[PDB]
Design a protein around this ligand. Structure first.
Ligand code: NAD
Ligand code: NAD
Ligand code: NAD
Ligand code: NAD
Ligand code: ZN
Ligand code: ZN
Ligand code: ZN
Ligand code: ZN
Ligand code: ZN
Ligand code: ZN
Ligand code: ZN
Ligand code: ZN
Lengths: 341, 340, 341, 340
């Protein structure tokens, strides 16, 4: 059908707690690009850190970085035959240039080439009715994967997956996972699938119930900095606020590994005496690469990864974001029904 | 003959000053030997012990850069194998030799309940005699003097361990912050592994020393306003917040930072930035006994030329003050354990 | 009780297919050593390669390198209190010096210091009533581990375990195991425990039945060099004769890993064109380290590793070796009842 | 103007000789560009193709060290971005850019059914014009001439890929067997990464060339009777049995051997010895596009000085014979694609 000249888009402005729905000129696809009519857009906590200030990005942007849609317009170099009408596609969040040094080494999650940015961090995001995508950054969603699970596997599944491959854990590893939410429950599933013994914490009774439901060999209901160390091979702190980071660096093994996978706090402090004497390793992990994306989609098709999404109204995004901050969402949430504006 | 008490320096918990007393000459247990101290290197970690940022139990002797001569044998030790008059160096961490960490090869990380590191509990080097588990001694190659050998076990060994953790070669570009006793050896080690070396210290003679030893670039200034030069590796051998902040701005994306120093007991980083750029922060502590062997090779061969000066045993307290005030050229080491 | 002045020992002589039982002066323990009265000695195929020539060692030696016994005499430096009467100990096969560069780096499986050799490869082995052991190379057998399983975990379990840690496989890896025998069935168990998808081959119906019984997700009954490649992450060839090596290098993944874990053939040929273009990796693996030994004994106590041994008569060693060459032994076999000479 | 046929060298399956014919000037497809060849390096792998030990489909053009100038644009390619008159180098493996292996970064290992490596099927360099997927072109830095640039994509790139697989630094001690076109660059690369380098070739001028370029030790003789000198790493860039046997005797315990050459299509090792000593044998093929970028940097900066001579296009068959008889000093590269 006909692509419109203007669509509705949630615009962020540096200084406002809420997103403003506005009228955006629908983008015309550049060379090597297409226009996606959004089918499902995942809501992510990082967007609350943006709206709150703790992760600053350019103003006057459309947020949203968990993107799934169909191609409805084609730029130069894209042959319409290559990308058929009706086919569901998922976008590679980081939106890599695909030809720079970070990209060509793998590590295209870390692209910082100057003619693009990460989705929902400047480049027009998922909280709108249409957005651009470079063809190189689109993956065909395998039949049987719903649009909503497909959206959230680009970040809620992808990110802990990339981090856990960093962790090089296996059936003899014993790992700890702090914070069990959108990423967290996927984190449990993928650690369990890699084979590791898993223990999981999260304040929400619902989220611990999901983790016990998902194979977490131990779902703890408490965790104080006087519960002596169980010397895990690997701690994934997926909230990463000073409270949980302190807990993690006490609970990890000598010469162990801690990944602060969350953006709970823009600064973070560690005991240096201990870090040094026990040769602790803290590793940054950011999103995941496009190879990682191909792999996780394979595993979601295989039923190994079974993401836990819920649908919601596009028009309700702001309200939905409110309930995310108060933590009244079971696992992740995804906007659908974009034509209800 | 072996006296029954000897003179030692005891850190008591609560004094910024070690006090010199008579301390009992311990009996060499099984597999142990009693050494008369020949050179005891002076490490800044000892100012951290005294000033209280690093806690060791009290009633303790604090030196941990140890070289000496066998002078009494415990049950199990063949004097043919470990002759009197032979200069040995001690392995500072003092591993047990048998636990999971020791058999891993990570024996710098031994926490076997049988022993503790030298000078963090176990009778360290700031005395006339100490004990050594002879699995933890290494024969000082002829040509290597006691002073340089004593510095080799820490001021060389520790940066050498760290820089092999860092996996750098002739193609790497790195930055070293801090050019004292560890730092100048760190310049030497990184150059021997091939890395292009950038170096910064506040002391001008430390900077010139880094120039002397082949540092490709000596920054005379380094502030947070300077643009990042994107090093593969940054070894911050100061490890206060100032230097850590610089290290995390100046390290390349997905790069490595090792805070090798103990300048501050707590450190904080930019979590947005460590996450987004997937930065690696790794602790690195002392060195392994395999590392010890390797570095004594590299010192014998002249690849490493540890920079030392000698002072009197009796002057330890004065020179430790000189070190806190940054007035030691590189590393100082005590000689003449008889003058008292 | 009283240690005797002479005991019975199976001596190998370069040139004879059979071991000769002889009268050996019982060894007097050196400094840091003890004398072990053997409780259980595992029989290993490598001993058939020694007897057959394909793995040459000094003549006039006692073979046997899977050793379990009790301490009955103490050398200088060993305090009798430290090593109590009646306690079962297992020996570290490679018999490392424990202070050289190979030893101090881990890798003490690769000790080649000049004042010792591997058990059953020069240094007096397990096919006798008593043998020496350095205290550093003895591990207390945890209560509940029988002497026979304890013997075979020093090599039948240890060796594939060390190799598979080399392989860095996890719940997402898919690996292939050729040859399912003494090592082979332990190999299956430990791959399954590390999490990997496992497919296993062996000519013996009994041994494939054991592998299907032990968790092998696929137990193949055939394998020809025209079964097209299933592109395994990792192939463990535990027979390593040219037949199986060719199979392995075709079946492995691009940039995959092949370990020839067997001594089936002293020479071995590979297609160089393929090895190069697909960046294949062939890795030698030998026995395992003493850290590895501590770990496998932990896991055997934990019931994770459940070795499959059978007892036999010391006096029947030679006959037993005959049935090993014709492959009429289910899994591994261990000599017991040493006082039946 | 772009001709509709050009002159090319076709390997036909069954001849030890490539034959020169007219071959159609292919039309640049989507994302592709048609280049006029400016320099085509001559690789010994081509003698292996001709002599039959390495099989490529027939009716093929065999050059794979490719540099040239854009001269026609296919659908999708902006001439502003890829100007005529600009010297590009091609990435020999010619990856698809999008498959699992390409996104891994292991794009030297691409086996996407869309394409194949240059000169093993895809219209290689032994002709006047070829096609390039412009994701697979790299702009030749000014100062770098076509000849050296064409050699940089293979004779430099391949040992550079291999030696980074080998993880060596200023502390490593290695041996290189084979000092032709790959080998002399391999000496340069290992020296740039810091390794102590030992080198052996049969040709004396190859040995002297290795001396020229800083090889620490040039063996004038190497036989199996020689004692093992226990190298961390051995790169056998001959890879016949003779040289492989030497490599596996001379490599240290738990050490690395890479048989980089294609001297023999099958190789055998001592299984007792590979097992007992836990030897690592690793294949290494071409280089990645990240590797390509890095090496063009290192050549521009003068860290790598690839050793080339130029000959006429028309003489390819004569010089390939000269190469089989070991009579090329290092690497030769074809110029003057107009003289015919
Ligand atoms: N690339 C990355 O590193 C990356 C990618 C995506 C998201 N993130 C960050 O991961 C974090 C979580 O992501 P999400 O979208 O799943 O958030 P979410 O709101 O879906 O899940 C949050 C969970 O955090 C739990 N929690 C909060 N504080 C806790 C505590 N102190 N102890 C135990 N549990 C606690 C809550 O109970 C909730 O179940 C956010 O910071 C998000 O921005 C990082
Ligand atoms: N296992 C380990 O990781 C390990 C082992 C031993 C020592 N250390 C630590 O290494 C650090 C240095 O030890 P040392 O004995 O070499 O000290 P030192 O006294 O010999 O010299 C330290 C150098 O730091 C320089 N410096 C101090 N602050 C600086 C700054 N803000 N910017 C630039 N340079 C600065 C000083 O000028 C001096 O040149 C100490 O914290 C010590 O405890 C760590
Ligand atoms: N450190 C080491 O690398 C190390 C250590 C111990 C043993 N080994 C070697 O491992 C090999 C096996 O050890 P084991 O003691 O378990 O032997 P074993 O006799 O107990 O088991 C042998 C198994 O090999 C199977 N087999 C033989 N040829 C086969 C083939 N072509 N295809 C499929 N299966 C085949 C047999 O059916 C039998 O089940 C021997 O070479 C042994 O010496 C190596
Ligand atoms: N991807 C790869 O791994 C890859 C890529 C390109 C080329 N290659 C292979 O590299 C090998 C060499 O290529 P080149 O172009 O450098 O060859 P070249 O003709 O330039 O020189 C090869 C050198 O080998 C020396 N040599 C031959 N036999 C020797 C021996 N027995 N002992 C010592 N030296 C000997 C010759 O004297 C000559 O100096 C060939 O097999 C080539 O196919 C591999
Ligand atoms: Zn997100
Ligand atoms: Zn990029
Ligand atoms: Zn110190
Ligand atoms: Zn220990
Ligand atoms: Zn065996
Ligand atoms: Zn040893
Ligand atoms: Zn080539
Ligand atoms: Zn590809």
């Amino acid at each position: 059908g006909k692509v419109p000249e203007t669509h509705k888009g949630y615009v962020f402005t540096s200084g406002s707690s809420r997103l403003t729905l506005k009228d955006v000129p629908t983008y015309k696809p550049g060379p090597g690009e297409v226009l996606l009519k959004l089918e499902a857009s995942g809501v992510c906590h990082s967007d609350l850190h943006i709206l709150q200030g703790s992760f600053p990005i350019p103003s006057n942007s459309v947020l949203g970085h968990e993107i799934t849609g169909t191609v409805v317009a084609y730029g130069l170099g894209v042959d319409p035959k290559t990308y058929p009408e009706g086919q569901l596609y998922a976008a590679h969040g980081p939106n890599p240039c695909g030809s720079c040094r970070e990209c060509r080494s793998g590590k295209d999650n870390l692209c910082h080439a100057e003619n693009r940015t990460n989705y929902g961090l400047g480049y027009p995001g998922g909280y709108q009715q249409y957005t651009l995508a470079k063809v190189h950054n689109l993956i065909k969603v395998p039949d049987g994967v719903g649009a909503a699970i497909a959206a959230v596997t680009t970040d809620a599944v992808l990110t802990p997956y990339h981090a856990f491959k960093k962790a090089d854990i296996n059936g003899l590893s014993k790992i700890l996972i702090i914070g069990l939410g959108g990423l967290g429950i996927n984190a449990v599933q993928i650690a369990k699938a890699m084979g590791a013994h898993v223990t999981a914490y999260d304040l929400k009774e619902s989220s611990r119930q999901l983790a016990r439901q998902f194979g977490a060999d131990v779902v703890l209901e408490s965790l104080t900095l006087d519960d002596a160390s169980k010397e895990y091979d690997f701690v994934a702190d997926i909230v990463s606020i000073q409270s949980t980071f302190d807990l993690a660096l006490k609970q990890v093994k000598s010469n162990g590994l801690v990944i602060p996978l969350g953006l709970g706090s823009p600064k973070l402090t560690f005991d240096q005496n201990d870090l040094l004497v026990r040769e602790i390793r803290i590793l940054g992990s950011f999103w995941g690469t496009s190879l990682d994306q191909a792999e996780v989609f394979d595993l979601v098709k295989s039923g190994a990864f079974k993401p836990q999404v819920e649908t919601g109204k596009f028009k309700d995004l702001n309200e939905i974001l409110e309930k995310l901050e108060k933590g009244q969402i079971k696992s992740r949430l995804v906007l659908t029904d974009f034509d209800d504006i």
